[PDB]
Design a binder for this molecule. Structure first.
Ligand SMILES: [Mg+2]
Lengths: 527, 242, 121, 145
RNA sequence: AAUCCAUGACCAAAGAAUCGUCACAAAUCGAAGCUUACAAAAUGGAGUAAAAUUUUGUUUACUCAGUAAUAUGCUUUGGGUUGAAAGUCUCCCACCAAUUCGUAUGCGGAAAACGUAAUGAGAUUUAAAAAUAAUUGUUUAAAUCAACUCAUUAAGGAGGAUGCCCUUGGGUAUUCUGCUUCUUGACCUGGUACCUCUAUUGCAGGGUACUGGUGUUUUCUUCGGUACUGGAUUCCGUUUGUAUGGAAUCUAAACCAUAGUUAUGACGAUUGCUCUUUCCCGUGCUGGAUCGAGUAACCCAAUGGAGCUUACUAUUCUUGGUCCAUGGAUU
């Protein structure tokens, strides 16, 4: 079906008879003619992908496309109604016959997954004004047309356009006669006097000899829910001009792209993805150093004091006395070492004690001291020698979830979940995710059901049952007030062992400086 | 929602029979309270501690809201409750609360002497404590008794209606309400309107501004009034049912 | 058997979408009242006459509730119409440990009854 | 640094103080018997003088001097008995208490002054007044049936 | 001359955070949001119980989506918001293989009457500041330092010399020779040669290739081309050619801020910071606990972003460093 998908790429490394796989990141792979495969992804990891590909090129042909093929993304409901008014076809084609009707659908989710329309379009500067297409069969649009769209598909012409875009000879021939703005203005001025002296034409006709044929590609993505149009490098500017010329189109940026992709449920390679190598490495570095510089920038008595915050954990320990993790970044090294120490404690004996080369730990304070001395040693040289958090999206199905004194050797897999606040509270990034205890299980259930005042309104003015410290199961990376539902959406990553531990889906959220615990429910995301 | 807990009934004794004009004036003033905007109304009936209580249960309340105000209740859409205050002077002619607590919903008191305050703070199953704001207070409002009666749950009731009667008693009412605010330390303060005429009832904004300028913070006024009136209505209904 | 359901084809020109509330099954009552009041106020500056209220399936009951609320509360003429909605469902047909999400697809039409509710000013 | 103003909306309500005449118990009937009309002897300088007298009599000398610096009646008409008085944000509670303590007019007796909406802008006051006027018509239309 | 202590002068950074409450099927000092309509119960759903009917079929009485929705409620935030909202400062917010600053010019930058780096000099006796465009109460300097202004240094690769760790060798900094970085373009006048239109020619106008010249380019401040960017509906032609084009009627909107039009209110409670008051272990500890005060000043948005300048911090909150400034002590 040659449909576009967005999956998780890996860096495979097999010399002879040994295979070790590392999490690389995202990628978009597309097949054409069963032999031409295109792979598009982030440049920083694209360099490594190209390197590991060129390392094995004895029976394989590689082609880089960084300054000869480009793509632009459209989002919204009326995104295709302007792309149609901008694009014009050179001669009759079935791809355009389907795209014309698709432009009137107005709903992207109604269309099926397989929808790729490619053809040869006219120059964007050829058009004077963005004239809209024929709109008279708008009412007679039923499901039979969409049902037939999956059957009727011109594979031949679309494959020819794809092969023309891949081959570097036709891609260069496309630049045969690239008319200048002065030439187009002269053509528009000479068409003022045509042989039919009855109709005013402001456009200019197409020529089979003195005109360049420009190939376009249009693909729909199911995950990002957007329409990506691919076009050569030097041809993108004229299309972009006429696209932005539409008075319902603004330019979306990487920050607004982040807002959009955070809106639905989606994730990011550099910022959100905490388990890949490049993403987590540069995330931890850049964010930690930036926050630390902004923190040391302000003087004493002017910044929030993470070190001195009372009433954070019940039965306070004399180890940190402030924040348990890192003051700036959501650190998973402390999380994994703490959980490893807790697992060791439960493995030596059924119960855990709080207060009493490296010592044989008998209390969680020794685990906190181990975390602290490890971080103090790390304060000098590189961090993350192997990893801190992997992702097990398939291994539990592969064999099983499987849980001598290192505390930092084996990592702890995490699942991508989304926690939604069901009551009063506002989340932020680098937030802590705690698990609801067993003794105070009915109080949170009653708070989630309802507790009103005798006046009638809700009641949030009560005493909070502060939980213990050994309840860290996750960290929220993208915490921002959700505007699509009216509550606070939290994008975190919880542990699978603690997910199976609890018999309920309730979970507590806390900030990095705030000492209040909000209640919510998390939902698993299959990404 | 707003709650009024101090609507007086035009009848002092039990031999006192009601007059149709008094019932009409009470209907007028309740309609005016509902017009200014209210949800809960609790009419009060005054009685003397020296008067003989009847040997009845079916006749303790000469109100019978169901037969008189039961039509207004489902027409205009409000509620009415039973409340009785006790004008207590000295420890005599009494020693009966278990039979007056089952008939009515809210039980109040009106101490006017030295021993009256002590007996009100000692062994009286009361909810609200009311003082004579019109005339002078008995001796002096101190913390030793007020703190002890507020820590158990009994609140102090303030009548902003007595001020709008004449011009001379305004000074005494102010000097008494400020003493009550200074002694109670602004925790257990509930307010009511003891007006019998529809010309002496105000809205929430005016009353709030008055009590704010008289010595009570804006948080105390709102929170106390609303939640404490709702809670006293709730516990009265609960002790009436069970 | 695994089968997913996509939404129904919505073809709105420029203004039929504006003066129209699509009542979901999870949409609260008071939010619907607020948005209906906003639409009722903004219609005659949008240039329409009525406010469309479309709901299908589980939300039909509370859609009729919203209708009969404004029927007598604000004394505004209401018009109820019974329509049919065709929805496309994507099912897997039987014909290697592969994820069930990435499998062969077949489209099937399903007709459901729905209520359109117009409110005048 | 910036002059902060705050307008107060007040209404004159006449209670049906007549014990010889029985009254109908409903919403719109009491709304109509409470919003009947204002008397002819009603003006802006006659209400401002009365409220100034009441303020000087209840608060005192300095209490009236501090509020009478920016105490003006911006908009008021006797047809519906709704007025908008301008005052400062510091003495707004004092003006509300003075409106509450308004006893009677020099010639007209038996009336209540009700403060409804208070804010620091006239646009929102006008919007709330229009909303209240629209809400008033609903019970009237419902009861006319 | 070295170190320490106290004061004063000058440069640079930042503008503490958390919780709860406020009547009206609507409200508040305000604001936003809870709308890609379905519980696969529409391929004319799945079954149970009774009567009658020679089974079907028909009439009554029920079960199933249960993680179920819960009626003006509910969640969020709101004056420095990128530390100055302040200020008669500058600029972007349509393109233009080019009469359109076609500007490879120290670096960064789309631009900036923009930031910074190395060297030399300067003070109404000067390139220019004073005692014949913006801003600032004082408004650069004029022993040395510090600050302002102006005048030079084009990007990358290769060879030699010097200095440092190091003495196979390699790395960094400076300086000299020198190559690579190539869109047949200041503007304008005259002559010659070729082609097209005005429907024969000499001639009239435009384009291109070449040569010659300062040629009154003294309007020393904008003067080039193209572009219907709100919404609704109707008419007509089409496998003879273009697979889409032609034209018509009516309205007025384009209304958009994780503050938005001068609104950002009222108090209560908790944590943190400065100095002083005392105690303790082990001198000391971003140590703990009381007894207190302070949490300031400059000033406030009206479309958005960047640069610069100017106001701020004396018991009227703070922090870091420097000083060929003085004061005391030791060597
Ligand atoms: Mg301004």
């Amino acid at each position: 079906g040659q449909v576009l998908f967005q999956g998780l790429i890996y860096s495979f490394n097999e010399e002879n008879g040994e295979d070790s796989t590392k999490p690389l990141g995202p990628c978009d792979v597309f097949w054409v003619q069963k032999d031409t495969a295109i792979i598009r992804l982030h440049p920083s990891i694209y360099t490594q992908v190209f390197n590991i590909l060129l390392q094995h090129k004895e029976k394989l042909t590689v082609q880089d496309c960084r300054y000869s093929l480009a793509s632009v993304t459209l989002k919204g409901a009326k995104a295709l109604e302007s792309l149609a008014s901008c694009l014009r076809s050179t001669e009759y084609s079935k791809s355009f016959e389907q795209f014309k009707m698709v432009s009137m659908i107005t709903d992207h989710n109604a269309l099926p997954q397989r929808c790729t329309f490619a053809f040869e379009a006219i120059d964007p500067r050829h058009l004077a004004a963005p004239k809209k297409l024929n709109d008279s069969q708008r009412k007679t649009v039923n499901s039979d047309d969409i049902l037939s769209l999956h059957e009727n598909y011109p594979q031949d012409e679309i494959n020819a356009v794809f092969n023309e875009l891949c081959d570097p000879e036709s891609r260069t021939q496309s630049y045969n006669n690239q008319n200048t703005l002065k030439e187009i203005s002269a053509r528009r001025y000479k068409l003022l006097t045509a042989t039919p002296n009855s109709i005013n034409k402001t456009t200019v006709p197409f020529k089979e000899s003195d005109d360049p044929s420009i190939p376009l590609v249009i693909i729909r993505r199911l995950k990002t829910r957007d329409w990506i149009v691919v076009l050569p490098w030097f041809w993108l500017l004229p299309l972009w001009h006429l696209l932005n010329r539409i008075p319902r189109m603004y330019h979306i940026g990487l920050r607004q792209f982040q807002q959009i992709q955070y809106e639905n449920k989606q994730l990011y390679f550099p910022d959100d993805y905490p388990f890949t190598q490049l993403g987590y490495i540069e995330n931890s570095f850049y964010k930690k150093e930036a926050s630390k510089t902004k923190w040391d920038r302000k003087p004493m008595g002017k910044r929030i004091n993470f070190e001195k915050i009372k009433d954070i954990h019940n039965t306070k320990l004399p180890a940190y006395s402030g924040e348990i993790g890192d003051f700036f970044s959501s650190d998973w090294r402390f999380l994994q070492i703490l959980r490893n120490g807790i697992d060791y404690l439960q493995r030596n004996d059924k119960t855990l004690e709080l207060m009493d080369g490296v010592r044989d730990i008998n209390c969680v304070n020794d685990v906190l001291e181990f975390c602290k001395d490890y971080e103090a040693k790390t304060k000098a040289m590189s961090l993350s020698i192997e990893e801190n958090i992997p992702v097990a999206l398939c291994k539990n199905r592969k064999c099983q979830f499987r849980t001598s004194f290192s505390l930092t050797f084996f990592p702890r897999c995490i699942i991508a979940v989304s926690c939604t606040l069901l009551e009063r509270g506002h989340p932020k990034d680098n937030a802590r995710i705690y698990q609801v205890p067993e003794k105070d299980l009915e109080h949170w259930l009653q708070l989630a059901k309802g507790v009103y005042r005798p006046n009638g309104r809700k009641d949030h003015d009560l005493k909070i049952p502060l939980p213990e410290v050994h309840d860290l199961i996750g960290f929220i990376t993208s915490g921002t007030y959700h505007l699509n539902c009216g509550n606070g959406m939290g994008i975190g990553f919880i542990d699978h062992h603690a997910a199976i531990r609890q018999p309920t889906r309730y979970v507590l959220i806390r900030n990095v400086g705030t000492n209040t615990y909000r209640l919510g429910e998390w939902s698993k995301i299959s990404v | 929602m707003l709650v009024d807990l101090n609507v007086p009934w035009p009848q002092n004794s039990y031999a006192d029979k009601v007059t149709s004009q008094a019932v009409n004036n009470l209907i007028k003033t309740l309609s005016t309270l509902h017009m200014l905007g209210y949800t809960h109304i609790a009419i009060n009936f005054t009685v003397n501690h020296s008067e003989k209580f009847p040997n009845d249960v079916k006749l303790l309340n000469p109100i019978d809201i169901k037969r008189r105000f039961g039509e207004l209740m489902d027409r205009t859409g409000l509620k009415l409750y039973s409340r009785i205050t006790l004008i207590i002077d000295d420890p005599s002619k009494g020693q009966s609360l278990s039979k007056i607590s089952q008939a009515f919903d809210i039980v109040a008191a009106l101490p006017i002497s030295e021993k009256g305050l002590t007996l009100s703070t000692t062994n009286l199953d009361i909810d609200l404590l009311t003082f004579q704001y019109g005339s002078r207070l008995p001796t002096f409002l101190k913390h030793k008794s007020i703190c002890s009666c507020v820590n158990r749950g009994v609140k102090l009731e303030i009548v902003y209606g007595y001020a709008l009667r004449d011009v001379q008693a305004r000074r005494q009412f102010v000097s008494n309400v400020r003493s009550v605010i200074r002694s109670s330390r602004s925790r257990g303060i509930v307010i009511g309107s003891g007006a019998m005429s529809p010309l002496e009832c105000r809205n929430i904004l005016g009353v709030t501004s008055l009590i704010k300028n008289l010595g009570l913070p804006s948080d105390r006024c709102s929170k106390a009034m609303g939640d404490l009136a709702s809670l006293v209505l709730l516990n009265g209904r609960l002790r009436n049912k069970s | 058997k695994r089968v997913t359901k996509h939404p129904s084809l919505k073809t709105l020109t420029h203004k039929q979408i504006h003066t129209t509330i699509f009542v979901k099954s999870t949409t609260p009552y008071v939010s619907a009242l607020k948005r209906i009041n906003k639409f009722l106020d903004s219609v005659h500056k949008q240039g329409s006459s009525y406010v469309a209220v479309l709901g299908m399936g589980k939300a039909v009951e509370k859609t009729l509730a919203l209708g009969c609320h404004f029927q007598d509360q604000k004394n505004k003429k209401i018009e109820v119409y019974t329509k049919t909605i065709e929805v496309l469902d994507e099912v897997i047909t039987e014909g290697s440990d592969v994820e069930d999400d990435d499998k062969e697809t077949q489209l099937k039409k399903r007709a459901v009854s729905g209520v359109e509710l117009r409110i005048y000013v | 640094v910036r002059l902060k103003s705050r307008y107060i909306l007040f209404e004159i309500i006449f209670p049906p103080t007549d014990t010889n005449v029985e009254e109908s118990v409903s919403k719109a009937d009491i709304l109509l018997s409470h919003h009947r009309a204002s008397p002819a002897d009603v003006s802006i300088k006659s209400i401002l003088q009365e409220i100034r007298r009441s303020l000087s009599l209840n608060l005192g000398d300095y209490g009236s001097a501090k509020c009478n610096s920016l105490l003006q009646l911006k908009y008021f008409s006797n047809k519906t008995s709704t007025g908008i008085i301008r005052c400062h944000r510091e003495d707004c509670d004092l003006v509300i208490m003075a409106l509450m303590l308004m006893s009677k007019i020099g010639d007209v007796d038996g009336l209540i002054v009700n403060p409804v909406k208070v804010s620091g802008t006239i646009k929102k006051i006008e919007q709330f007044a229009m909303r209240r006027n629209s809400k008033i018509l609903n019970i009237i239309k419902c009861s006319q049936s």
